[PDB]
Each structure stands twice: as C-alpha cells, then as structure tokens.
C-alpha cells in the first residue's frame, strides 16, 4: 500500500472456463505407428507409446532402428497409420512431463524391438522416411 | 462515400496511435491542467508560440511527465 492507486485497476471478470483432459482422435492408440510432418524428424516413421497429461504424445524411434530418440510430439502435427505393434511389453510409467524439463531409452527400446521382430519387414519400415511422390493425392491415400 | 455507418467506436474515437488524446496548450498554466491525465491526454503546443516559450513549456512538461505530441518543432525541423 506504499503507493495509492493512480487511476484505477479494472479487475477482470471471473472466467467460467475450466481446463479438461483432451479427447484424442480415435486412430491414435498405444502401439500405433506414426508419421511426423514437421520438426527435425519430419517424414520419419516412429512408434507411439503413451499420451502425457500436457497433451504431448510420447514417441520412440526406436533410436536403435532409425535414430529417433524418446521425444514429445504434438498430436495435430502427426499422421496415424493403420499398422500396430503391441505395447504391452514396454511398461512406460516412470518418465513423465516433468522428467523432460540414454539408459531409459535402452530399456524401452529392448522391449519395443522384442515386439517389432515378430511382424515381417517392420524394422525396415520404421527405418525409412516417408514423402509424397508425384501423382500421390493424400485424400484417396489410406494411411 | 462518407456516411454515419463509417463512424468510429466511442472508446477509440479521438485517439492517436500513441493512445493519447491531443490537447492544445498555449502556456504553462494551460499545461498544468493536464498534470495527472498523462495516460489519457498528451499536450500539443500551439502554432503561434514563440521559440523562447516552447523550451519552457517542454521543460515543465517533462517535469510533469506529460507527453508532448510536437516537440522539436521550431526548435528542429520535421
């Protein structure tokens, strides 16, 4: 109170806007392969592990397969393909949002590779990048 | 074609891009009427003021902390 209020302070009206947990798109499910459309790893195929509280999807390359480390990715900048891997092998509880502010990636990668081996040619798929060739129309293209 | 529908909003009317309404000032006494309304108003020295008076007005305005719209006019050009 060391200064009397010069002019006046207009208090903001109370806001009836409570934040609620996000409702993700139906295609996104744990163990779903993803295509990243921007950033350092744009056009690179990655695996989906879990959805964080702050609405940043968590993804692993695996770094072993394609050199993409554990990372947070925005959901809207990602395409979801119809091919899946079982994520039950990897537990994915410890690492969280605040944690993001090598050994863990190795632990995750061993379990995820274990499931990757069963499906044919999946490692090659995750290794290679994606791009649009001439004559490719996305709207028909089933991803 | 001019017409009333083009009229500007009252809350934004008569406002410079700096956000200060321009008020004409002739002498120090008229400057002092804008002592606290520094946020709402900015002073503008009249065209007919002599150079000797303009420096005094500018000094008093700086002391009061009132924005002058046209300083360095007739003390500098443009």
């Amino acid at each position: 109170p060391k200064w009397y209020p010069s002019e006046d302070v207009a208090a903001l009206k109370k806001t009836r806007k409570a934040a609620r947990p996000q409702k993700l798109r139906a295609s996104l499910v744990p163990g779903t392969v993803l295509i990243l459309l921007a950033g350092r790893f744009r056009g690179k195929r990655v695996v989906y592990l879990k959805h964080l509280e702050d609405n940043t999807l968590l993804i692993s390359g695996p770094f072993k397969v394609n050199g993409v480390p554990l990372r947070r990715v925005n959901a809207r900048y990602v395409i979801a393909t119809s091919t899946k891997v079982s994520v039950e092998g990897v537990n994915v509880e410890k690492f969280n949002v605040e944690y993001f502010a090598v050994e863990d990636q190795k632990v995750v990668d061993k379990a995820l590779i274990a499931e990757i081996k069963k499906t044919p040619l999946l490692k090659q798929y995750l290794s290679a990048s994606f791009s649009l060739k001439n004559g490719d129309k996305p709207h028909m293209l089933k991803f | 074609q001019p017409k009333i529908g083009y009229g500007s909003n009252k809350k934004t009317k008569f406002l410079s891009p700096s956000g200060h309404k321009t008020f004409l000032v002739a002498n120090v006494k008229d400057l002092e009427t804008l002592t606290m309304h520094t946020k709402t108003y900015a002073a503008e020295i009249a065209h007919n003021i002599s150079a000797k008076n303009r420096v005094v007005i500018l000094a008093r305005a700086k002391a009061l902390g009132i924005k002058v719209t046209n300083p360095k006019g007739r003390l500098a050009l443009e």
């Binding site: 060391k2 | 700086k62 360095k72 007739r74 003390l75 500098a76």
Partner: protein, 514 residues
C-alpha cells in the same frame, strides 16, 4: 513492496563502501530504475522521501560505478580500458546492463551543465561494460550527441563533446563509426534553426565535429565521402527535377529542397573538416586522405552556387564563397571564385538603381540565407550586398597578396572591373569597386618590384614558395587594407553580440517584476 526509507538508503550506502555483493547492486539498480521511471510508466520499491531519493541518486551516480570497478577492476591495454575474462565480470556486466538505460533516461532529460557532467562521468566509468552492447552504446552516443546537439548552454555542449573525445580516443573501434554518423546526421535533420543566438553554438558544433573526423585519417574518409555523396544525390535530384518537364514534385520551386540552411550547414562543415585535416602542420610533409575529398567538395559547392543566380539567394552564395576561401587558405588549393562573383555583377541589384528606400534594418548577411522579399530592390539591400561583395573580393585576392603570380592573377580582373566600373550607373558601387581596383594595381606594382630581384624561374617550386617568407601578409597593400577592413567588420559583429546579449539581460529584468 519495500518502501524507500532514509534508513534503507543509508544502509545500502553503508555496506556499499565495505564488502558489497551482487544482490545489493541489483537492489540499488532496481530502486534507481523506479526512481527514474516514476513519471514514465510491478516495481519492488516505492519512493516517498525526497531525502531518500536524492541520496539514492547521489550514491548511485557517484559510487555504484566505484563499487562496480572494485568488484571487476578493468586493466588498461594499449591505452584502452578493457575488462578481464571471468565469471564475476559477466555477472557485473549484466548489472551495468541493468543500469545503462537509467543513465540513458537521465541523459535524455539533461537540463543543466552540472547534471550533464555528473551523468556523463558516471557513464564514463561504465563504458567497459557497455561496449559489449549495441542497443546501449549506440543510444548512448546517440543521446549525448542529442545533448551535444540540443543544449543551449555552451558549457553543456563543451562537456558533451569532451566526453565524446575522451571516450572515443580510448577505444576507436565500436564507437567511432557511430559518433561521426550521429554528429553529421545532426547536421542533416536535427539541425538548430539559425539565428544570431545560435550562431556561436552551431559554430562550436561544427568546429568540434571537425576534430572528430580528423582523428582517424582513413575511417573519416570512409564516412564523409559517403555522406557528402548523399548531398550530391539531392543536388542531382533538384537539378534534374527543375530542368525536366515532369510534374512529379515541385518542378518550379525545387530550390526549397536544396537551398536550406541545413544543406549550407553541411557544405560549411565539410569545408571546415577538410581544412582542419589539410592544415600544413597536420600535413607535416605527409599526404592525408581527406585532401582527395577536396575536389568532390569543391564540385558540389560550385554546383550549388550556380544553380540559381537570383538576388533572393545572393547571401547563400556569399557563405559558401567564404567556406571555399577558407578551404583554399588552409589547403592551398586554387579555387576559381572570381568568375562567379563577376557573373553576379550583371544582376539587377548590382547594376540597376534602387527602386524603394523604406529605411528598414540592415540585412544580417553573416547569419541569414535569404532576402525575405522585402529587402529586394532597396537601397539598404544593394548597399549591404555590395558591402559584402567588395570584402569578399578583398579576401580572395588577399590570399595571394604576397605570391609572385599575383600580377597575372590581377590583370584579367582589373580589366573586367574597369569595364564594369565604366559602364555601371550606381555611384556608390563604382566608388567601392574603384578602391579595390587601385589597391589591386598597387599590390601588383609591389610584387613586381619585389620580383624584379628574383633569379629563379617559375619551375623552381621550392624557391617560389620561399618568396617573401620574411614579409608578413598584412604588410602588403591589399593586406594592410583588408586586414583593417576585417577589423571594421569584426568589431561590428562584436557590437551586435554585445548588444543582443544586453537585450536579453533587459528582457530578464521584466520577468523579475512580472
């Protein structure tokens, strides 16, 4: 929010003089920031006592630099004050980075000499941290140039320029390419409206900025050559615009763009700069780069003088003529100026009899650029125009008053003058022109009698430059005349100033009783 108390400032100063810490410096600087931003805008500190505020200002400006130096003592290297490498320096550097624009606000709000000196000194002891920034070092040199440009106190201007020299000569790398730019840009846009009051001040500004260009022989050449070229662009734009038919911008009255005081201020400042750099002693038998800019400057000035041969702008011609005479005096370059003067001697003012005689005040040829349309075709204006013209001839032909080439520099002029004198109707003009004619013939005879005893030919430049080195220039018939005339002019200007000064004194008396 902490409130400033006379206790708190006393404690901060108490622990400043013994064992300060970065926390204390940030606290002091934040309080200082509030203090300087009270009128112009969250803040941790509140100020209520004038004693506490004054004490804060005092201790800050006079001792926060001292503590800053003590924490991070700079070392003199090759004449420059340079900080060392270390973590503690970087922390202090951010602290000075948090003090700098409070100093800037003080600089922009200077109103008197002593406050200017204090702010400039405190700023002086904080260069070595602020040389690392360019939003601050530029605005610093931009602000003090602003003070050097807008102050009406000659002492404040002297303090600002002394600061500019002292800081510039130490470092020369970050600032010098900006000091020159800011000063000459002052002479372009933020130029002071001319009047008998501002003449000594603007003369000091020019005589001061001239020295800065001369310090760095090469870099000055880099700067001025660019800026003079800017003038040429305007010069070329107006010539084409007037001459061509295009109705783009002011075909008929384009003179307004180039026939302005700011432009004449420019061309005078450049002559002063080149004259300063090209002086024989500073030359010291060593060529300087600035001499090569003499030719561009002369071409620009001559191009400006001839762009209008109208009476309304004869005062403009006279000022640039004096500038060219100065340049030739200092550098020794041969400027042809008589063709211009004799070319004006066909005008309607130098030739036709006066029409009106309202008995107005005499025109201030020294301190004006324009006739104002009331002095046109008047007895006073003709009588003053000729008064200037005759003395300008006296000066120009007094430059070579003691040279061996003066006879043949005089012959074509005496013949043409007698042609004009014999055909001119105005009696007073013929009397004045006559005087110069006989004195020119007299000095021609003087030089002839002194040259009849010479054994070396024109090719021997060494001896030609030695001719009458024993004789003073003022002892020649044209010197002894014109020197006296200069006094009869100089005294006049003095009695103007020693008059105008009193007018203000008298004016002051009135506000005492108001």
């Amino acid at each position: 929010k902490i409130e400033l108390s006379l206790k708190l400032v006393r404690k901060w100063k108490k622990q400043l003089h013994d064992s300060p810490s970065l926390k204390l410096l940030r606290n002091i600087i934040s309080a200082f920031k509030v203090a300087v931003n009270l009128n112009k805008e969250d803040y941790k500190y509140a100020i209520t006592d004038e004693k506490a505020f004054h004490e804060l200002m005092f201790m800050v400006l006079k001792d926060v630099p001292q503590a800053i130096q003590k924490m991070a003592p700079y070392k003199i290297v090759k004449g420059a004050r340079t900080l060392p490498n270390g973590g503690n320096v970087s922390r202090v550097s951010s602290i000075v980075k948090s003090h700098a624009g409070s100093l800037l606000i003080l600089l922009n709000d200077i109103t008197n000499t002593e406050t200017a000196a204090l702010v400039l000194h405190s700023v002086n002891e904080l260069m070595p941290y602020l040389l690392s920034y360019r939003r601050i070092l530029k605005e610093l040199i931009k602000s003090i140039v602003g003070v050097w440009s807008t102050t009406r106190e000659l002492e404040t201007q002297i303090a600002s320029f002394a600061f500019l020299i002292n800081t510039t000569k130490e470092f020369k790398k970050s600032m010098l390419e900006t000091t020159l730019k800011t000063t000459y840009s002052t002479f372009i846009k933020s130029c002071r409206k001319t009047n008998m009051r501002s003449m000594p001040l603007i003369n000091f500004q020019k005589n001061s900025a001239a020295e800065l260009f001369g310090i760095d022989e090469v870099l000055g050449y880099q700067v001025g050559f660019e800026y003079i070229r800017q003038l040429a662009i305007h010069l070329r734009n107006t010539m084409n615009a007037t001459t061509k038919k295009s109705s783009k911008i002011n075909s008929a009255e384009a003179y307004k763009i180039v026939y302005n005081w700011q432009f004449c201020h420019s061309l005078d400042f450049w002559s002063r700069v080149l004259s300063f750099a090209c002086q024989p002693e500073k030359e010291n038998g060593s060529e300087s780069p600035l001499r090569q800019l003499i030719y561009p400057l002369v071409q620009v000035t001559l191009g400006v003088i001839r762009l209008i041969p109208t009476p309304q702008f004869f005062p403009l011609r006279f000022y640039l003529i004096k500038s060219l005479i100065r340049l030739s005096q200092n550098s020794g370059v041969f400027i042809p100026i008589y063709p211009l003067l004799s070319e004006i001697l066909t005008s309607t003012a130098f030739t036709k009899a006066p029409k009106k005689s309202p008995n107005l005040a005499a025109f201030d040829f020294e301190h004006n650029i324009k006739c104002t349309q009331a002095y046109l075709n008047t007895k006073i204006y003709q009588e003053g125009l000729s008064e200037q013209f005759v003395d300008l001839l006296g000066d120009y032909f007094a430059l070579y008053c003691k040279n061996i080439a003066f006879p043949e520099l005089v012959t074509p002029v005496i013949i043409s003058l007698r042609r004009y004198i014999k055909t001119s109707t105005n009696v007073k003009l013929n009397k004045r022109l006559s005087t110069v004619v006989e004195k020119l013939n007299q000095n021609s005879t003087f030089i002839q009698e002194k040259r009849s005893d010479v054994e070396f030919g024109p090719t021997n430049k060494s001896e030609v430059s030695r001719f009458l080195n024993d004789v003073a220039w003022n002892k020649t018939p044209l010197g002894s005349y014109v020197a006296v005339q200069r006094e009869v002019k100089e005294e006049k200007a003095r009695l103007m100033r020693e008059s105008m000064e009193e007018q203000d004194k008298e004016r002051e008396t009135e506000e005492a009783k108001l």
